[PDB]
Amino acid sequence: GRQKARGAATRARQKQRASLETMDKAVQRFRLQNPDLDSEALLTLPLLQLVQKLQSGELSPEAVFFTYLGKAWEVNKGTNCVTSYLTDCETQLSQAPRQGLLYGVPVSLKECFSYKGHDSTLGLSLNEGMPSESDCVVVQVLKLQGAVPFVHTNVPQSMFSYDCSNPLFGQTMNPWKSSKSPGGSSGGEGALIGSGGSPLGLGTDIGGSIRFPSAFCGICGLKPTGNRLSKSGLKGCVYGQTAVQLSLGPMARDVESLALCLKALLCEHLFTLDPTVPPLPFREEVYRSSRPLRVGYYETDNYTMPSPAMRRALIETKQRLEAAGHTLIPFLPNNIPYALEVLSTGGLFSDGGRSFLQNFKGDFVDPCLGDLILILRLPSWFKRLLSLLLKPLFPRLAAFLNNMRPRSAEKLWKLQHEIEMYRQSVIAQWKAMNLDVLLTPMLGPALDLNTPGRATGAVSYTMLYNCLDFPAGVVPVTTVTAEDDAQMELYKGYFGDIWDIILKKAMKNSVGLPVAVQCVALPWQEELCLRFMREVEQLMTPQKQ
Amino acid sequence: GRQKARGAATRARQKQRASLETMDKAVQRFRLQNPDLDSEALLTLPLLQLVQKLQSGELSPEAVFFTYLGKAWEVNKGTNCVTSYLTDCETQLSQAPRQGLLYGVPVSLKECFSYKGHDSTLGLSLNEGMPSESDCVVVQVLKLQGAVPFVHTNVPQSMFSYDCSNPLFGQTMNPWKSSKSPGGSSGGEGALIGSGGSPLGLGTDIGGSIRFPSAFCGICGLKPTGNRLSKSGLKGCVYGQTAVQLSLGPMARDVESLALCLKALLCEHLFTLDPTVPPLPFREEVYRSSRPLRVGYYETDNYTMPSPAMRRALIETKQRLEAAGHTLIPFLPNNIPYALEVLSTGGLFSDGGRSFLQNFKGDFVDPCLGDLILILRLPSWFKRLLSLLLKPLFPRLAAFLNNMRPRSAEKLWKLQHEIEMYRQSVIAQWKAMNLDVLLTPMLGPALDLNTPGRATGAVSYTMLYNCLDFPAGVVPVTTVTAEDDAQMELYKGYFGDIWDIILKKAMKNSVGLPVAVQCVALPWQEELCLRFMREVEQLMTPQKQP
Ligand SMILES: *[C@](O)(CCCCCCc1ccccc1)c1ncc(-c2ccccn2)o1
Ligand SMILES: *[C@](O)(CCCCCCc1ccccc1)c1ncc(-c2ccccn2)o1
Ligand SMILES: [Cl-]
């Protein structure tokens, strides 16, 4: 029976179509009244300058809103990144608090950021036609800071994916190349911000879901420490999994934009609306520091062989940092295989997938999820026998499979404790070399559509820091050259298993696509992390001031 | 076989004896050289004044250290609160950083605060002769702030108890009345600080273990939000249970001492030594505020009927707050039975007790734990059958028994999510009435020895805030009167089960014993919480000296 799933799809498509139609009408009505508005001047302004002109009165909020609405609508045509037009938002426009740190700034939202009167489907049939009954906390704070949230953007079915397709709204494409994934689970945001259609957005990230789409689409993203920001009111599909913690964070065209966004969120409105978040205000002094940095670095995690473009990105950044006076120290977190295979996978799937799979009862399984659902459905004894068979030839596959089995509360306790010990073990490493920050590769360039679901190993660069729960952001530093792309033909991977084979093929045909590096700091050091991101932005892409 | 347990007891008792003997020799040697030191003047100084005089140079650190060491040794004689003399600590004395916020202050440590070269036994055989390899983080911070940690103090076997006895170092007694429990699991500290033998100490608290001993021994304690202070290096016996988190916090003779101790701990040293703790510095402006407060309150949680002393303590505090200009708003957190029976008990024993019971293999089970170990050992089906049998008669006993069973990772996720939602439910309730703070009763007067283990129900007043993970502190406000004590003979309890019956008997003969109220704020509001504790202290113990 798929009648219910087909009904949901038909309806979701109707709403998305209607929303885009409403956007078109609003944009045309505005343009007829403002024939002389220099829209490209306004669209190309960096957020900081846009904000200052909104604040001075030089730009009206309406001019900014409708110009950006027009561009969002245009870029959606080739990306399918927008799922819904947040229908209140013009009335919010007219009432945006004037002294707010984000006054007059349109902000895009990953679909799971609950918004009153709108579904947060996550691409699942069961969530369709169940509108949210209030704004989640961070949407409330944005609004109290004068921001104007205006679209929900697309995500892969269930959000447990670094691709971006679902059976409801379909497939989001990379704005730089249609055959490529925008990444995700925050892929809508990546596609939208990456093509100029929103100056600022929020995403979420449990295995790389802010960082993948940022990297793949050539923009900036920060995954803070999990509890730096509020997850109150967020839509999700598994509840009470605390071993590997969700984080929510900003995505934007530059580092300053992420900094401003954090500064606006980390205010009294957030702290009182959600007392469970520690009231740590944005430390501007740490963000603005120009002190030389002790920067740890690795060019590979020995788990996912990096692409030629990834490796060159890393070495060139290393080199410009050295040239600017920073100390670059080789550093690799210990026991990565164990963090990924036992701690991260086990933490994410301690119950064998059963809670997660309830979401798919009755539903279609998007092709971009691959065989994940098929695998999770297998009984525990079969996952185990399969694991023992695969171990000698494909130890990685064997490891994930074994750790995706159900267990007792007793074993989850043991797992939670190991996560905590691992965390302190890397902190210890870090302190022993006296690092300030850590520079790593970031998976790049964008994989072809429907391949992230088949290259699970490639999450190693990002998931490590979900497991450690350290702040981690990504900055675009280069684009893939023909030379980089030709060298993929020599890429073999460290394991030679199906994940390596698919990644080889998936990263081909990527000339001109953006490639990032990743910046990490210790827990609660989001300001230092951003300070480091700002430095990399400056040295590698000087033109983004 | 208890041959190993007996061996560990014999050794631990030798060490304790040797420790105390070393303390005596050091005290005697000092006193010989300082015949004209007014030790009572020095002992009776409040910590803030003591700190200032250490800081000016008017009192030497040696004077303060040895005078306090002498008092500790004296009060131990009738309390058995000291398990070990922290042997480095005279060398640390000589090297204590002069600009440190706690320069020259002797500090007592609950035995689970790891200290280089010493066991943290927790009263368990299996931890004896396994000396800690370094100081835990908060001990390091204390030392970097110029403090001088000097004794490990006693705890009930495993710490999972609000009495204070174990098979290794034995039973700690209340300094006010030796037939009474000092409370605990931080009972050593309560007994030591409560009789004058230490001006400041740190304890831990997962179900009330800072607040019970503070309340029972007539002193102050704060249980902060769990992750306000670093737990790195703390000794425990259950690993990876994150549903109901442990919290560490100060104990002292007044509120200002708690404030100073939090201020000294919340510095860059702690934050960089344990990056997992959010670097929230102590907000003095919030602590020193004298704004009128919206104070929620209840005289009873409808779970544990309060003793007459508890209820009067609560109403008199309510009344003085109103007299002082604060708004007192009736308020009771919703669904307390659920939070205690399902959320707290389940989170604490999600695995049916199996990890916890590992600690007791081969060991004696201290009488003061009651039947806890016997009940955890019971197979799951039998816990369940027993529970259905008890349900009609004793629903409370039935509930705990049912929620003490093992479950899957899947159900723990559901539970962890329920804890998180309940937390938000109470927060919403709290915001709906626009409270600043909450005033509740606090269990007591001190129960007789070996009865906390049989009055599990009486953790209701404190464990609620472990479950909610709100900062909660206790302040002494009155002592039990003849009239309060006479009225316990009419105490029936709300359930009439064996826990109500034992509490009635256990609080008997308590004239003169201290009785506290409890102060709560929202998560991360330790400064507001302490501000409110200060106000109750000012109104109810006006003769509490500066
Ligand atoms: C996003 O980070 C997910 C990226 C894809 C990670 C797949 C990891 C994996 C590991 C082992 C086996 C298979 C796959 C992301 N952002 C939000 C969420 C999310 C998911 C579910 C509930 C709430 N939030 O994932
Ligand atoms: C302390 O808070 C314990 C107070 C007693 C709580 C008993 C609650 C209970 C009993 C039976 C059934 C259900 C609930 C305290 N402080 C520290 C610790 C501790 C214990 C074990 C390991 C580490 N820390 O308990
Ligand atoms: Cl936290």
XYZ file of C-alpha atoms and ligand atoms in Angstrom, chain B residues 110 112 122 158-163 184-186 204-212 235-238 246-247 340 344-345 348-349 356 372 400 404 456 459 462-463 466 499, ligand 2:
67
model
C 34.288 14.075 49.857
C 35.357 10.531 45.645
C 33.644 4.782 48.185
C 29.000 3.161 46.843
C 27.665 6.691 47.575
C 24.179 5.624 46.492
C 22.535 6.380 49.833
C 21.538 9.299 52.029
C 23.043 7.716 55.127
C 24.742 11.936 52.855
C 26.259 10.555 50.552
C 28.365 13.678 51.547
C 28.466 15.517 45.051
C 24.732 15.009 44.555
C 22.693 12.792 42.204
C 19.562 12.397 44.394
C 20.209 14.914 47.241
C 23.712 13.990 48.451
C 24.888 17.606 49.052
C 21.552 18.729 50.400
C 20.657 15.908 52.817
C 35.588 8.578 41.258
C 32.220 6.898 40.659
C 30.784 3.382 40.429
C 28.354 3.610 37.452
C 25.674 13.896 38.886
C 26.505 17.387 40.107
C 10.438 10.223 40.814
C 14.477 9.395 38.088
C 14.347 5.774 39.204
C 19.214 5.747 37.596
C 18.481 2.053 37.074
C 25.764 -0.946 39.995
C 18.498 -1.995 47.868
C 9.739 1.880 42.046
C 14.074 -0.712 38.538
C 13.563 5.780 50.014
C 14.190 11.632 48.514
C 15.624 16.633 46.545
C 15.687 14.114 43.687
C 18.348 16.108 39.963
C 8.550 4.049 53.963
C 23.476 11.243 46.442
O 22.717 12.266 45.775
C 22.598 10.018 46.630
C 21.371 10.329 47.468
C 20.508 9.088 47.701
C 19.592 8.903 46.501
C 18.917 7.541 46.479
C 17.824 7.595 45.395
C 17.144 6.274 45.075
C 17.372 5.125 45.837
C 16.730 3.932 45.504
C 15.856 3.883 44.425
C 15.621 5.026 43.660
C 16.265 6.220 43.983
C 24.700 10.888 45.560
N 25.731 11.677 45.300
C 26.565 11.036 44.489
C 26.056 9.841 44.209
C 26.599 8.817 43.403
C 26.088 7.497 43.472
C 26.673 6.507 42.662
C 27.734 6.854 41.809
C 28.189 8.178 41.793
N 27.627 9.111 42.558
O 24.871 9.734 44.896
